[PDB]
Amino acid sequence: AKILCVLYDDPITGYPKSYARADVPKIDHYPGGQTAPTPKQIDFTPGELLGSVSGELGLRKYLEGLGHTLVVTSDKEGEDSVFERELPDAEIVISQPFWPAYLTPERIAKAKKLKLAVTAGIGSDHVDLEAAIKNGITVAEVTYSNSISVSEHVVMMILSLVRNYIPSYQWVIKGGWNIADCVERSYDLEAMHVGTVAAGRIGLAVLKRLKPFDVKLHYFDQHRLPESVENELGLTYHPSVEDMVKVCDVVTINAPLHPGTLDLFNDELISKMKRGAYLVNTARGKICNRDAVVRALESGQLAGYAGDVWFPQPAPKDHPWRTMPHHGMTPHISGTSLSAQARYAAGTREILECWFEERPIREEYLIVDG
Amino acid sequence: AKILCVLYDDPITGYPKSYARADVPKIDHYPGGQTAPTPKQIDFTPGELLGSVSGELGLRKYLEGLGHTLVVTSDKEGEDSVFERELPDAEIVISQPFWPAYLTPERIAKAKKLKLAVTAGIGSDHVDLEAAIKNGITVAEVTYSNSISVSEHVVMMILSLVRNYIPSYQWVIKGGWNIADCVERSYDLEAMHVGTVAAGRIGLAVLKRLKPFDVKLHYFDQHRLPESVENELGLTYHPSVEDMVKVCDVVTINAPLHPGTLDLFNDELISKMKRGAYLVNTARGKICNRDAVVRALESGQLAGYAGDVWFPQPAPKDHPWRTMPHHGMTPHISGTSLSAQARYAAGTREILECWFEERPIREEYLIVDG
Numbered sequence: 001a002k003i004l005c006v007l008y009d010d011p012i013t014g015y016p017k018s019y020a021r022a023d024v025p026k027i028d029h030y031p032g033g034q035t036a037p038t039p040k041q042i043d044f045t046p047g048e049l050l051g052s053v054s055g056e057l058g059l060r061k062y063l064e065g066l067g068h069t070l071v072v073t074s075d076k077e078g079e080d081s082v083f084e085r086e087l088p089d090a091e092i093v094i095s096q097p098f099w100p101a102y103l104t105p106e107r108i109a110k111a112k113k114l115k116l117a118v119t120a121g122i123g124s125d126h127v128d129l130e131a132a133i134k135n136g137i138t139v140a141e142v143t144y145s146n147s148i149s150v151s152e153h154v155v156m157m158i159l160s161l162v163r164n165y166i167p168s169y170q171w172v173i174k175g176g177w178n179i180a181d182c183v184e185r186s187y188d189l190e191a192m193h194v195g196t197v198a199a200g201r202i203g204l205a206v207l208k209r210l211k212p213f214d215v216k217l218h219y220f221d222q223h224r225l226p227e228s229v230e231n232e233l234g235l236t237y238h239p240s241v242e243d244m245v246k247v248c249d250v251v252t253i254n255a256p257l258h259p260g261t262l263d264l265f266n267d268e269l270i271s272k273m274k275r276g277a278y279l280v281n282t283a284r285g286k287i288c289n290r291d292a293v294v295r296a297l298e299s300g301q302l303a304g305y306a307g308d309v310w311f312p313q314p315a316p317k318d319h320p321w322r323t324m325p326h327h328g329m330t331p332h333i334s335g336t337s338l339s340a341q342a343r344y345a346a347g348t349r350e351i352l353e354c355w356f357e358e359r360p361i362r363e364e365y366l367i368v369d370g
Numbered sequence: 371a372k373i374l375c376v377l378y379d380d381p382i383t384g385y386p387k388s389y390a391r392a393d394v395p396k397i398d399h400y401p402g403g404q405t406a407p408t409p410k411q412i413d414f415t416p417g418e419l420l421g422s423v424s425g426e427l428g429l430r431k432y433l434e435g436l437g438h439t440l441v442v443t444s445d446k447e448g449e450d451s452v453f454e455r456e457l458p459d460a461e462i463v464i465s466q467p468f469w470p471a472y473l474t475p476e477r478i479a480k481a482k483k484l485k486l487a488v489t490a491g492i493g494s495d496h497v498d499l500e501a502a503i504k505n506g507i508t509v510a511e512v513t514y515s516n517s518i519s520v521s522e523h524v525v526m527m528i529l530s531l532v533r534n535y536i537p538s539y540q541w542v543i544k545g546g547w548n549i550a551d552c553v554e555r556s557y558d559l560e561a562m563h564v565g566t567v568a569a570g571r572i573g574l575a576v577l578k579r580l581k582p583f584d585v586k587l588h589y590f591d592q593h594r595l596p597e598s599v600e601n602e603l604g605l606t607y608h609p610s611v612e613d614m615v616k617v618c619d620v621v622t623i624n625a626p627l628h629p630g631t632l633d634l635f636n637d638e639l640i641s642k643m644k645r646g647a648y649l650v651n652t653a654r655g656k657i658c659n660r661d662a663v664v665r666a667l668e669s670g671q672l673a674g675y676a677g678d679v680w681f682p683q684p685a686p687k688d689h690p691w692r693t694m695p696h697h698g699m700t701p702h703i704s705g706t707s708l709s710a711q712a713r714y715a716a717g718t719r720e721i722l723e724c725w726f727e728e729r730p731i732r733e734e735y736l737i738v739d740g
């Protein structure tokens with residue numbers, strides 16, 4: 001069987017010959033009970049770069065050992081791409097949200113042999129699920145693999161926006177000191193109201209990390225948390241996003257991209273936020289209206305915006321989130337720390353092993369069971 | 371009387387004409403139950419810029435109402451400085467650590483009428499206490515006023531170093547995407563070993579904030595915490611700094627600058643840290659050897675360094691911490707967020723009220739009772 005695997009380019013300096021550190025911590029479980037991925041073996045050392053083309057998610061020796069072929073490419077856009085040229089033949093397709101090979105209805109129809117689509121990461125919005133179901137295709141993602149990584153990025157970005165980190169760092173680089181320049185927009189996070197859209201794996205991890213900062217916590221989720229959890233964290237549940245954002249100094253978005261979240265943060269909802277609110281979005285780019293964010297930063301309605309997720313990806317050179325005032329953006333990286341890569345790579349293998357050995361794929365990994 | 375108050379320059383764009391936020395959270399007390407400052411009145415809105423020359427720590431109306439004179443400058447360096455000029459006559463000297471008017475033994479000899487030296491902030495290492503004790507000069511600082519502010523800065527810097535935030539932001543500004551270049555040095559903090567030098571007001575606030583990141587916590591303090599506290603936070607006590615840093619992925623320094631700590635992180639101590647350790651220092655610059663830090667970052671012994679404190683202050687344009695690799699520096703800003711300034715400015719006025727009304731200055735503010 002042919003496995004077709006789309007990954008991002010190596011670093012422009014070459015695939016790394018060494019790393020800043022010798023190893024990474026062992027993670028073998030997640031809050032709430034779920035175990036870390038359980039492949040029978042891994043053919044990499046946690047901490048290696050796995051998610052770029054030379055890394056191959058550590059899959060080659062395993063797949064070739066079983067008589068399969070593995071095609072790895074970053075070339076994923078259009079009919080002429082290696083991806084589309086190889087797609088009709090592939091039984092299995094794998095990519096990461098950070099560099100996603102879209103399975104549109106058109107691509108799915110062309111993909112005559114496709115039985116399994118794996119998301120190495122979380123969030124399968126790049127796969128047409130209606131089309132997968134129609135064609136009996138199984139769709140899996142590595143649930144929880146990077147949720148914590150994101151939660152860390154979120155808290156980092158909230159503190160960086162509120163405290164005015166990056167502007168202050170720039171004064172250092174520019175050879176200045178300029179205390180008042182740095183702190184005329186520098187606040188403490190303490191005792192601010194912070195709210196999350198969603199309290200799933202990421203959102204709950206964010207709340208737990210925010211708690212000791214002594215903020216007042218708020219959230220909305222279609223699935224309300226147990227009352228006892230609300231009480232332990234000091235959470236206020238709100239019946240809607242709109243109702244929540246009205247009282248928040250800071251809002252972080254941690255819901256998947258789907259009908260109810262597409263363009264959720266448009267001019268109208270942003271206008272309901274407190275003037276000078278901070279908005280953080282490591283969920284998906286399209287949950288926030290591109291130009292509405294820009295307008296709100298320009299007017300001061302938002303004091304700052306930060307996230308790692310864009311529409312489209314990669315963001316073109318002219319993408320206006322690059323030059324809008326008061327941002328702390330990164331490219332789409334939070335879910336692809338080297339730490340996270342070890343887990344979703346192990347998880348991708350665990351899924352492939354279940355597939356080939358005809359064992360059930362873990363229930364929490366399954367998005368459609370074909 | 372004459373009050374001589376050294377503050378930092380206004381922003382280059384002048385005293386702020388507006389702010390990003392309408393207000394700041396009300397903070398009436400600190401963890402453990404010390405009250406927030408208790409002046410009879412304040413003449414500012416919390417959230418206003420107070421620590422620059424036009425801000426005046428909001429003291430003018432009050433001091434002039436009592437018939438006193440208030441002289442505010444940023445000109446603090448040498449014998450031909452406004453500070454030194456004005457010093458012979460001043461009954462009270464006020465300055466902040468962010469832009470410190472150093473009270474050396476010569477300047478104190480010169481300071482014929484000086485009876486009260488107030489640190490608007492925390493940490494009086496710019497004041498020679500023995501020369502001050504000699505002259506029955508009172509030395510006071512606004513204990514706890516910005517402790518929490520620093521702790522937030524620390525967690526922000528730890529996350530930014532470990533996850534590789536600033537170089538990733540720069541790819542955004544430069545028009546790139548470059549996922550692998552971002553993440554080839556990007557780790558999660560989760561389950562790393564983190565140690566603090568000191569668990570006082572800052573150190574303990576750091577530990578509490580790091581706890582739900584699910585790191586393994588370590589500390590040294592000259593005064594060991596209660597067992598119940600170490601148990602609750604899961605802390606490993608070490609009998610020295612050297613003993614702790616050998617097992618830490620991240621070290622944060624939160625001790626005052628004194629003989630115990632001057633030049634503590636030298637070539638030797640740093641050589642005992644893990645290869646690729648991260649070091650954060652928002653305490654005082656001199657606690658780390660300037661050139662040692664540079665060498666360690668150049669060799670990769672440290673994967674990163676971040677902090678807001680320097681020697682001297684301001685740092686010259688050629689100070690090597692500006693250009694050394696893998697840093698996340700700011701100028702000395704963490705204890706002077708707008709939120710902190712509201713508290714230390716209030717505390718400054720509280721102190722002055724006590725002095726003028728011949729009431730005792732709260733004991734927790736007193737460094738020397740003269």
Ligand SMILES: NC(=O)c1ccc[n+]([C@@H]2O[C@H](COP(=O)([O-])OP(=O)(O)OC[C@H]3O[C@@H](n4cnc5c(N)ncnc54)[C@H](O)[C@@H]3O)[C@@H](O)[C@H]2O)c1
Pocket residue numbers: 121122123124144146147150197198199200201202203220221222223254255256257260261282283284308309332333334335336
């Ligand atoms: N690198 C990255 O930036 C990165 C990595 C992983 C995940 N993500 C994104 O974050 C999303 C969340 O991941 P997770 O691990 O928390 O998933 P999860 O499934 O554990 O949690 C998602 C939560 O969103 C809630 N939800 C759905 N629609 C909502 C709405 N309209 N309002 C409020 N809550 C709503 C669900 O009830 C659920 O609790 C993923 O779908 C993905 O899009 C980003």
Ligand SMILES: NC(=O)c1ccc[n+]([C@@H]2O[C@H](COP(=O)([O-])OP(=O)(O)OC[C@H]3O[C@@H](n4cnc5c(N)ncnc54)[C@H](O)[C@@H]3O)[C@@H](O)[C@H]2O)c1
Pocket residue numbers: 491492493494514516517520567568569570571572573590591592593624625626627630631652653654678679702703704705706
């Ligand atoms: N803007 C800033 O970056 C900023 C702001 C305020 C404070 N500071 C610095 O932080 C220092 C600590 O502030 P704090 O509010 O926590 O004060 P604190 O007095 O509550 O805490 C100091 C702690 O350090 C401990 N200590 C002293 N010598 C030590 C040593 N050699 N090893 C380990 N622990 C040692 C003490 O026992 C105490 O627990 C201040 O003295 C100041 O230099 C920096």
